[PDB]
Amino acid sequence: INENVNASKSRIKDTDFAKETTALTKSQILSQASSSVLAQAKQAPNAALSLLG
Amino acid sequence: INENVNASKSRIKDTDFAKETTALTKSQILSQASSSVLAQAKQAPNAALSLLG
Numbered sequence: 001i002n003e004n005v006n007a008s009k010s011r012i013k014d015t016d017f018a019k020e021t022t023a024l025t026k027s028q029i030l031s032q033a034s035s036s037v038l039a040q041a042k043q044a045p046n047a048a049l050s051l052l053g
Numbered sequence: 054i055n056e057n058v059n060a061s062k063s064r065i066k067d068t069d070f071a072k073e074t075t076a077l078t079k080s081q082i083l084s085q086a087s088s089s090v091l092a093q094a095k096q097a098p099n100a101a102l103s104l105l106g
Contacts, residue, residue, distance in 0.1 A: 048070040 051070050051074050
């Protein structure tokens with residue numbers, strides 16, 4: 001019973017390392033993409049300023 | 054909601070730099086033309102004096 005209960009507890013509570021590493025990689029790529037898009041987006045008022053004078 | 058509210062407020066309160074620069078240029082040319090025309094108009098009394106006597 002202890003073996004079966006430990007198996008159930010691992011199923012419900014333990015980390016699936018493959019899925020979590022994939023999720024971490026996806027999160028890192030999304031964060032880098034968002035940072036790059038933010039760096040690109042901060043230059044729109046530069047285009048606004050280019051119209052002045 | 055805050056993002057959408059700021060996007061809304063930009064369309065009412067914030068200025069359009071393209072339209073405003075175009076308007077400023079138009080006003081500058083209008084003022085220059087009116088100044089030149091007034092400088093030419095203040096030359097009617099010299100026609101009056103040179104008429105005779």
